[PDB]
């Protein structure tokens, strides 16, 4: 029975390891066309098929490739054999009878058989071409061939190699072509490899490196499957040529130059200088001397990881990667998945880059003057592998491909990255010496957009001081009360006189222009009327908190130069022992009243400070920030984020040492509202803050988010009456903020974000919607004075969506740190987007979101990358301080000689909580990459002086703590799953957490091992993807989260609506086929099954509609053989305690007994004819055949338009039911009710069933249903 005998051997050899992986996938994964490749050739002109059939046969003999077949069924390692002889035929057909459409169709059919009939390795020539006659000299040719034997450059050299003999023997002319090389040279190259070294190469390129979702924030999540997209782009001539020029003066390839911009690209969004992504290199390695000629498999995909040093440029990186480019040559046999097997990384390459060399598209439609015939078109059949692919192949000018699935990627998003690339070409090459992190990335379409588009508009409005907003507000009306302190309430006359007098003993005493002076009042009018008076008196206050230790205050007292001291006598220790021999006066101080109670005409300059309040940065002592007039007009003067009046009054709950309170104070006063200061013990105190609220009738108030959160879960009442709640300081607690909109609506909470240095805050989100898909709560748009900017460590814009440093200007930036020019320097800067203005790099990440509002990102110091996931070390160390009985805890990240890092938890509690009690609760609580690897315990944590922060150098965490439970399989499933992996790899005890390949597996077995679960002992899953899930968990979750049937599995239509139907699926068995029917269904939501092939598929259906609707009246449907499924069903609800409202059965009927297999399943799926497809046969095989061998639910049939005689093994449905088994007639035959035309007409009558309508309820019935909607909220 074999098909060859010994003489037809001319020779055999091993296989390269890449030929070795398309065997098995082939052996074990058939029909899946993954290495098939179809090459369309439209071919105008005279050809004579004949003569190209002879042509062939030569380029059979001339080349071993084409000759060969493989034997692996029994034989230790697999054997490629060549024969002597293998004679071609070329498959002629004509379809000049036919229409274009028609001819069209037919060759498209051909195709379609041709991807799934794949070759036969162990017999067929490993290539086929067919030709298609259209018309006299027209004709269409489909070339396949496997890719096991031949690459897409090589393919060319055959073209080339056949037309040279076509033109030959159709002229009778000789020929000659040059000794070709044998395949069998590189086999021996490669057998002389050491395997193991190459491995040993790469996991050395790879070595720590912390994985990439390439632009992760750009993905989007919804439902799998591949919707192939493209975009077709090219620089101009002259880009194209003076790139061209510079890889040639670098002497590198065109290729490796774009991967040089790529690179640059990539780096500006992904926060990082060490990248990846695929390249297609040749595998055509120069120690085989006359290797560039040889014919069949070498080009390999492999990863290409980029580390951008500070300040490369764009020549230094071109050298950087023609480098390493050779270095890698030797290894470029090695499989991709063998590369990732030992890598560390899943998602190791995301995307892939391709310069084809010289492409079959572009190279062969050139001269039918010597072919006789033009090659109007080519095309290849690309098989969509990566999410996003860049192909470029050289022209005039040069041609750039995006490739694209658009089910993760946006058209949008894709356009955006054309301009960013074709900038990149121009700036990069323009500027090839200058640091790469330097070079401008953005058009001017999208720089004008960014700067001017997403900021507010230009204000002339400009400038007074403080002094004179404040008149404003009292000549309003003097008599309106201004201030309130418990009970004492003062009018801004009086507020204004008060605050004259202070101002004037203060000039008195030389306060006036250029000096500092320091309040130290607790909470009370005076407070406020000190501020005032020194404002007034034209100098700067300095708020000073009496709870502070006393080497604070005195650091605070000399660093700011502090000439006077302004107090209360309810802190008369001022004298304690600070100390201060400064000038101290109090406005307790009943003397005052002999100065005047008019202001001063102190001349006052907006830029001048207005005060200084110290914060912790400068990890050591605190810094002082000098805030002015002119800063504190921007927050409240000519802004749009809402408007406030007269006919406001204000909660102050914040403390006079924090900028918050600068809105406090400077909102109400200067727009003529109430100030409510809160004394002291109500600050944090609830019950106290609800009752001055609600005692006071304050409509507006700043806390804190950590206060907002607090109150919002004590109660609602203090709430209620707010128009408007600003908060920010920490990140917004997404589910706190959503029962305060609720309670309160749209338009009233603020969430607002700023550095002290931007003076409170420089952007605010108005909160309107919550949608309920909602991560984290943004921090929206500048306020009307304000600018903001997304850049890169080099002041570079950073594309619309990327994370960047959030920088910030306009009138809100501080004159910067008292006493420290250093400081100031280092994080101050000129704006370089507007001349004249101040910029502020606050340290914090962010990204402009699609609509313009701004999603904070966290800090840079801050952050971790773990398998290819930004991480914010913030985010876990705050899940540990709110675990039940914590006290203190921080969150360290550290990698060893590598780069992989690790994040260890420390924790001081004293011996309440084992070590794992915390780690149960991360574990759900948080993502896995998240959870920390180890848990120290600790008494205290180190400090370093004023250090709220800790002396980074923690103990390096016991290694107990990487031991940890081992876990066996957990049901039968993971058990006999856990069986093959044991027999595959030949090893015991294994737990659900052990790799694969750790465990001694390599490319076939982890093949093999997924082959075991496809069918011999199993139920089928994806081959080459235990790559992929190297964890038997990890498969679990595979095939839970992503298996069959769940909350992604079975088909759902119409979401945001509410009215369930449960549908059951056609003879087919797939629920995807009635989305063509939920279009007509316009208000119900649909649940569309799949077709459980098991026996107890009875009880799965039984937990399915109970989980997606728990209690009521059930309605469920069915057309053809999902009527008997769906009856069997309603029949389990109501033995199992379920009420079935009624069923819509569709032209299918009762078993009433029993009555070939396959060919009727393949006849009905040619009345019909991978993700849709591949299991499409396996399914409807087994339900065509469950179907062949009473309830209390209505029924309705719709019945066929066309006549039918019925079976005395089919039948009505009117015995199967107790209640009404109504029914009506639809329009078309069985087949074509549920599509097209006749499909909409059957729509209507669908609601007469569920419309019903009519459905009288009663009195007692309809009221308490309205009752229960409503008590529902
Ligand atoms: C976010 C900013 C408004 C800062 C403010 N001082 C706070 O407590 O949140």
């Given at each position: 029975?074999?098909?060859?005998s010994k003489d037809q051997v001319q020779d055999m050899y091993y296989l390269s390891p890449m030929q070795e992986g398309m065997l098995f996938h082939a052996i074990l994964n058939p029909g899946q066309s993954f290495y098939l490749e179809q090459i369309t050739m439209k071919v105008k002109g005279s050809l004579n098929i004949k003569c190209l059939e002879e042509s062939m046969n030569v380029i059979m003999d001339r080349y071993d490739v084409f000759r060969t077949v493989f034997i692996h069924e029994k034989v230790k390692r697999p054997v490629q054999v060549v024969l002597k002889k293998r004679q071609?035929?070329?498959?002629?057909?004509?379809?000049?009878?036919?229409?274009?459409?028609?001819?069209?169709?037919?060759?498209?059919?051909?195709?379609?058989?041709?991807?799934?009939?794949?070759?036969?390795?162990?017999?067929?020539?490993?290539?086929?071409?067919?030709?298609?006659?259209?018309?006299?000299?027209?004709?269409?040719?489909?070339?396949?061939?496997?890719?096991?034997?031949?690459?897409?450059?090589?393919?060319?050299?055959?073209?080339?190699?056949?037309?040279?003999?076509?033109?030959?023997?159709?002229?009778?002319?000789?020929?000659?072509?040059?000794?070709?090389?044998?395949?069998?040279?590189?086999?021996?190259?490669?057998?002389?490899?050491?395997?193991?070294?190459?491995?040993?190469?790469?996991?050395?390129?790879?070595?720590?490196?912390?994985?990439?979702?390439?632009?992760?924030?750009?993905?989007?999540?919804?439902?799998?499957?591949?919707?192939?997209?493209?975009?077709?782009?090219?620089?101009?001539?002259?880009?194209?040529?003076?790139?061209?020029?510079?890889?040639?003066?670098?002497?590198?390839?065109?290729?490796?130059?774009?991967?040089?911009?790529?690179?640059?690209?990539?780096?500006?969004?992904?926060?990082?200088?060490?990248?990846?992504?695929?390249?297609?290199?040749?595998?055509?390695?120069?120690?085989?001397?006359?290797?560039?000629?040889?014919?069949?498999?070498?080009?390999?995909?492999?990863?290409?990881?980029?580390?951008?040093?500070?300040?490369?440029?764009?020549?230094?990186?071109?050298?950087?990667?023609?480098?390493?480019?050779?270095?890698?040559?030797?290894?470029?046999?090695?499989?991709?998945?063998?590369?990732?097997?030992?890598?560390?990384?899943?998602?190791?390459?995301?995307?892939?880059?391709?310069?084809?060399?010289?492409?079959?598209?572009?190279?062969?439609?050139?001269?039918?003057?010597?072919?006789?015939?033009?090659?109007?078109?080519?095309?290849?059949?690309?098989?969509?592998?990566?999410?996003?692919?860049?192909?470029?192949?050289?022209?005039?000018?040069?041609?750039?491909?995006?490739?694209?699935?658009?089910?993760?990627?946006?058209?949008?998003?894709?356009?955006?990255?054309?301009?960013?690339?074709?900038?990149?070409?121009?700036?990069?090459?323009?500027?090839?010496?200058?640091?790469?992190?330097?070079?401008?990335?953005?058009?001017?379409?999208?720089?004008?957009?960014?700067?001017?588009?997403?900021?507010?508009?230009?204000?002339?409005?400009?400038?007074?001081?403080?002094?004179?907003?404040?008149?404003?507000?009292?000549?309003?009306?003097?008599?309106?009360?201004?201030?309130?302190?418990?009970?004492?309430?003062?009018?801004?006359?009086?507020?204004?006189?008060?605050?004259?007098?202070?101002?004037?003993?203060?000039?008195?005493?030389?306060?006036?222009?250029?000096?500092?002076?320091?309040?130290?009042?607790?909470?009370?009018?005076?407070?406020?009327?000190?501020?005032?008076?020194?404002?007034?008196?034209?100098?700067?206050?300095?708020?000073?908190?009496?709870?502070?230790?006393?080497?604070?205050?005195?650091?605070?007292?000399?660093?700011?130069?502090?000439?006077?001291?302004?107090?209360?006598?309810?802190?008369?220790?001022?004298?304690?022992?600070?100390?201060?021999?400064?000038?101290?006066?109090?406005?307790?101080?009943?003397?005052?009243?002999?100065?005047?109670?008019?202001?001063?005409?102190?001349?006052?300059?907006?830029?001048?400070?207005?005060?200084?309040?110290?914060?912790?940065?400068?990890?050591?002592?605190?810094?002082?920030?000098?805030?002015?007039?002119?800063?504190?007009?921007?927050?409240?003067?000519?802004?749009?984020?809402?408007?406030?009046?007269?006919?406001?009054?204000?909660?102050?709950?914040?403390?006079?040492?924090?900028?918050?309170?600068?809105?406090?104070?400077?909102?109400?006063?200067?727009?003529?509202?109430?100030?409510?200061?809160?004394?002291?013990?109500?600050?944090?105190?609830?019950?106290?803050?609800?009752?001055?609220?609600?005692?006071?009738?304050?409509?507006?108030?700043?806390?804190?988010?950590?206060?907002?959160?607090?109150?919002?879960?004590?109660?609602?009442?203090?709430?209620?009456?707010?128009?408007?709640?600003?908060?920010?300081?920490?990140?917004?607690?997404?589910?706190?903020?959503?029962?305060?909109?609720?309670?309160?609506?749209?338009?009233?909470?603020?969430?607002?974000?700023?550095?002290?240095?931007?003076?409170?805050?420089?952007?605010?989100?108005?909160?309107?919607?919550?949608?309920?898909?909602?991560?984290?709560?943004?921090?929206?748009?500048?306020?009307?004075?304000?600018?903001?900017?997304?850049?890169?460590?080099?002041?570079?814009?950073?594309?619309?969506?990327?994370?960047?440093?959030?920088?910030?200007?306009?009138?809100?930036?501080?004159?910067?740190?008292?006493?420290?020019?250093?400081?100031?320097?280092?994080?101050?800067?000129?704006?370089?987007?507007?001349?004249?203005?101040?910029?502020?790099?606050?340290?914090?990440?962010?990204?402009?979101?699609?609509?313009?509002?701004?999603?904070?990102?966290?800090?840079?110091?801050?952050?971790?990358?773990?398998?290819?996931?930004?991480?914010?070390?913030?985010?876990?160390?705050?899940?540990?301080?709110?675990?039940?009985?914590?006290?203190?805890?921080?969150?360290?990240?550290?990698?060893?000689?590598?780069?992989?890092?690790?994040?260890?938890?420390?924790?001081?509690?004293?011996?309440?909580?084992?070590?794992?009690?915390?780690?149960?609760?991360?574990?759900?609580?948080?993502?896995?990459?998240?959870?920390?690897?180890?848990?120290?315990?600790?008494?205290?944590?180190?400090?370093?002086?004023?250090?709220?922060?800790?002396?980074?150098?923690?103990?390096?965490?016991?290694?107990?703590?990487?031991?940890?439970?081992?876990?066996?399989?957990?049901?039968?499933?993971?058990?006999?799953?856990?069986?093959?992996?044991?027999?595959?790899?030949?090893?015991?005890?294994?737990?659900?957490?052990?790799?694969?390949?750790?465990?001694?597996?390599?490319?076939?077995?982890?093949?093999?091992?997924?082959?075991?679960?496809?069918?011999?002992?199993?139920?089928?899953?994806?081959?080459?993807?235990?790559?992929?899930?190297?964890?038997?968990?990890?498969?679990?979750?595979?095939?839970?989260?992503?298996?069959?049937?769940?909350?992604?599995?079975?088909?759902?239509?119409?979401?945001?609506?509410?009215?369930?139907?449960?549908?059951?699926?056609?003879?087919?068995?797939?629920?995807?086929?009635?989305?063509?029917?939920?279009?007509?269904?316009?208000?119900?939501?649909?649940?569309?099954?799949?077709?459980?092939?098991?026996?107890?598929?009875?009880?799965?259906?039984?937990?399915?509609?109970?989980?997606?609707?728990?209690?009521?009246?059930?309605?469920?449907?069915?057309?053809?053989?999902?009527?008997?499924?769906?009856?069997?069903?309603?029949?389990?609800?109501?033995?199992?305690?379920?009420?079935?409202?009624?069923?819509?059965?569709?032209?299918?009927?009762?078993?009433?007994?029993?009555?070939?297999?396959?060919?009727?399943?393949?006849?009905?799926?040619?009345?019909?004819?991978?993700?849709?497809?591949?299991?499409?046969?396996?399914?409807?095989?087994?339900?065509?055949?469950?179907?062949?061998?009473?309830?209390?639910?209505?029924?309705?049939?719709?019945?066929?338009?066309?006549?039918?005689?019925?079976?005395?093994?089919?039948?009505?449905?009117?015995?199967?039911?107790?209640?009404?088994?109504?029914?009506?007639?639809?329009?078309?035959?069985?087949?074509?009710?549920?599509?097209?035309?006749?499909?909409?007409?059957?729509?209507?009558?669908?609601?007469?069933?569920?419309?019903?309508?009519?459905?009288?309820?009663?009195?007692?019935?309809?009221?308490?249903?309205?009752?229960?909607?409503?008590?529902?909220?």
């Amino acid at each position: 029975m074999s098909q060859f005998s010994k003489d037809q051997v001319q020779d055999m050899y091993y296989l390269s390891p890449m030929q070795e992986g398309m065997l098995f996938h082939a052996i074990l994964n058939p029909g899946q066309s993954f290495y098939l490749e179809q090459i369309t050739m439209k071919v105008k002109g005279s050809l004579n098929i004949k003569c190209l059939e002879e042509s062939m046969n030569v380029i059979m003999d001339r080349y071993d490739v084409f000759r060969t077949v493989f034997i692996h069924e029994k034989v230790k390692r697999p054997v490629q054999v060549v024969l002597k002889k293998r004679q071609f035929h070329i498959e002629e057909i004509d379809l000049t009878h036919l229409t274009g459409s028609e001819q069209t169709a037919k060759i498209n059919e051909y195709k379609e058989q041709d991807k799934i009939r794949g070759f036969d390795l162990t017999r067929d020539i490993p290539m086929r071409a067919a030709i298609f006659k259209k018309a006299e000299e027209s004709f269409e040719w489909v070339w396949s061939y496997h890719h096991i034997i031949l690459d897409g450059w090589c393919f060319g050299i055959v073209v080339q190699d056949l037309f040279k003999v076509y033109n030959a023997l159709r002229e009778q002319k000789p020929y000659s072509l040059p000794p070709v090389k044998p395949y069998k040279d590189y086999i021996k190259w490669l057998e002389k490899q050491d395997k193991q070294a190459s491995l040993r190469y790469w996991r050395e390129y790879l070595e720590g490196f912390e994985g990439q979702t390439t632009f992760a924030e750009q993905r989007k999540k919804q439902k799998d499957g591949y919707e192939p997209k493209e975009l077709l782009f090219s620089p101009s001539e002259a880009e194209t040529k003076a790139f061209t020029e510079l890889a040639k003066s670098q002497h590198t390839t065109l290729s490796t130059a774009l991967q040089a911009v790529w690179s640059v690209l990539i780096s500006r969004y992904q926060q990082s200088g060490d990248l990846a992504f695929g390249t297609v290199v040749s595998g055509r390695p120069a120690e085989i001397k006359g290797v560039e000629h040889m014919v069949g498999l070498f080009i390999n995909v492999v990863p290409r990881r980029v580390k951008l040093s500070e300040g490369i440029t764009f020549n230094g990186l071109l050298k950087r990667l023609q480098e390493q480019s050779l270095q890698s040559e030797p290894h470029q046999y090695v499989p991709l998945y063998d590369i990732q097997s030992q890598a560390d990384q899943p998602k190791l390459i995301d995307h892939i880059i391709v310069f084809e060399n010289y492409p079959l598209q572009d190279a062969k439609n050139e001269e039918s003057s010597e072919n006789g015939f033009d090659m109007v078109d080519v095309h290849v059949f690309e098989k969509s592998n990566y999410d996003l692919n860049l192909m470029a192949s050289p022209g005039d000018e040069m041609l750039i491909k995006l490739a694209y699935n658009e089910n993760v990627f946006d058209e949008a998003f894709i356009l955006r990255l054309k301009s960013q690339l074709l900038t990149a070409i121009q700036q990069l090459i323009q500027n090839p010496d200058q640091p790469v992190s330097t070079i401008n990335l953005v058009d001017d379409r999208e720089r004008e957009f960014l700067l001017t588009g997403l900021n507010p508009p230009a204000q002339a409005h400009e400038t007074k001081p403080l002094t004179y907003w404040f008149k404003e507000a009292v000549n309003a009306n003097p008599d309106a009360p201004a201030l309130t302190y418990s009970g004492q309430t003062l009018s801004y006359r009086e507020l204004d006189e008060e605050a004259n007098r202070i101002a004037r003993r203060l000039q008195k005493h030389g306060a006036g222009k250029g000096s500092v002076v320091a309040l130290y009042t607790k909470r009370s009018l005076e407070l406020v009327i000190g501020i005032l008076g020194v404002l007034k008196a034209g100098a700067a206050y300095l708020p000073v908190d009496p709870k502070l230790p006393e080497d604070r205050i005195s650091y605070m007292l000399a660093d700011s130069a502090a000439a006077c001291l302004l107090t209360h006598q309810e802190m008369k220790e001022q004298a304690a022992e600070l100390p201060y021999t400064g000038t101290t006066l109090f406005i307790d101080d009943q003397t005052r009243f002999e100065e005047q109670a008019s202001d001063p005409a102190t001349a006052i300059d907006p830029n001048d400070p207005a005060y200084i309040m110290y914060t912790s940065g400068t990890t050591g002592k605190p810094k002082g920030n000098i805030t002015t007039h002119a800063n504190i007009q921007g927050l409240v003067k000519h802004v749009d984020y809402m408007a406030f009046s007269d006919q406001d009054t204000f909660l102050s709950v914040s403390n006079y040492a924090f900028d918050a309170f600068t809105f406090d104070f400077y909102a109400s006063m200067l727009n003529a509202a109430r100030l409510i200061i809160a004394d002291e013990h109500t600050l944090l105190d609830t019950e106290r803050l609800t009752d001055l609220i609600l005692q006071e009738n304050v409509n507006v108030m700043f806390a804190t988010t950590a206060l907002f959160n607090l109150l919002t879960d004590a109660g609602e009442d203090w709430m209620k009456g707010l128009r408007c709640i600003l908060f920010g300081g920490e990140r917004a607690s997404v589910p706190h903020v959503r029962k305060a909109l609720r309670i309160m609506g749209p338009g009233k909470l603020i969430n607002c974000y700023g550095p002290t240095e931007g003076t409170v805050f420089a952007t605010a989100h108005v909160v309107h919607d919550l949608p309920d898909s909602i991560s984290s709560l943004p921090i929206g748009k500048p306020i009307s004075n304000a600018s903001v900017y997304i850049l890169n460590e080099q002041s570079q814009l950073q594309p619309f969506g990327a994370v960047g440093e959030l920088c910030i200007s306009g009138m809100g930036v501080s004159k910067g740190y008292v006493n420290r020019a250093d400081l100031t320097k280092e994080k101050f800067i000129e704006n370089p987007f507007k001349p004249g203005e101040t910029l502020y790099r606050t340290g914090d990440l962010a990204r402009w979101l699609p609509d313009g509002t701004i999603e904070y990102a966290g800090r840079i110091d801050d952050q971790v990358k773990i398998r290819g996931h930004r991480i914010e070390l913030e985010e876990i160390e705050k899940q540990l301080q709110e675990y039940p009985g914590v006290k203190d805890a921080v969150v360290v990240a550290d990698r060893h000689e590598s780069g992989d890092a690790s994040i260890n938890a420390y924790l001081v509690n004293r011996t309440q909580l084992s070590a794992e009690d915390v780690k149960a609760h991360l574990k759900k609580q948080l993502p896995a990459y998240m959870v920390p690897q180890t848990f120290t315990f600790l008494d205290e944590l180190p400090l370093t002086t004023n250090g709220k922060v800790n002396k980074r150098l923690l103990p390096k965490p016991d290694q107990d703590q990487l031991a940890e439970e081992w876990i066996g399989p957990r049901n039968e499933m993971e058990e006999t799953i856990a069986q093959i992996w044991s027999e595959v790899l030949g090893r015991k005890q294994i737990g659900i957490h052990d790799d694969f390949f750790a465990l001694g597996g390599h490319a076939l077995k982890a093949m093999t091992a997924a082959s075991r679960i496809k069918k011999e002992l199993g139920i089928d899953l994806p081959v080459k993807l235990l790559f992929e899930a190297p964890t038997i968990a990890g498969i679990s979750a595979y095939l839970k989260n992503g298996g069959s049937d769940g909350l992604q599995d079975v088909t759902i239509m119409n979401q945001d609506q509410e009215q369930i139907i449960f549908a059951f699926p056609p003879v087919l068995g797939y629920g995807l086929m009635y989305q063509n029917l939920s279009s007509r269904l316009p208000s119900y939501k649909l649940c569309a099954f799949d077709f459980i092939e098991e026996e107890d598929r009875l009880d799965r259906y039984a937990d399915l509609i109970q989980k997606l609707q728990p209690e009521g009246p059930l309605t469920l449907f069915g057309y053809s053989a999902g009527c008997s499924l769906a009856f069997e069903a309603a029949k389990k609800l109501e033995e199992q305690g379920r009420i079935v409202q009624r069923i819509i059965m569709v032209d299918s009927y009762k078993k009433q007994g029993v009555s070939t297999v396959e060919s009727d399943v393949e006849a009905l799926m040619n009345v019909n004819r991978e993700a849709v497809k591949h299991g499409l046969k396996q399914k409807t095989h087994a339900f065509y055949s469950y179907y062949v061998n009473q309830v209390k639910a209505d029924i309705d049939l719709l019945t066929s338009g066309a006549d039918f005689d019925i079976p005395e093994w089919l039948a009505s449905w009117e015995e199967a039911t107790t209640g009404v088994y109504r029914m009506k007639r639809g329009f078309g035959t069985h087949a074509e009710m549920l599509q097209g035309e006749t499909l909409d007409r059957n729509a209507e009558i669908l609601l007469e069933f569920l419309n019903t309508q009519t459905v009288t309820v009663s009195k007692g019935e309809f009221e308490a249903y309205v009752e229960q909607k409503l008590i529902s909220e």
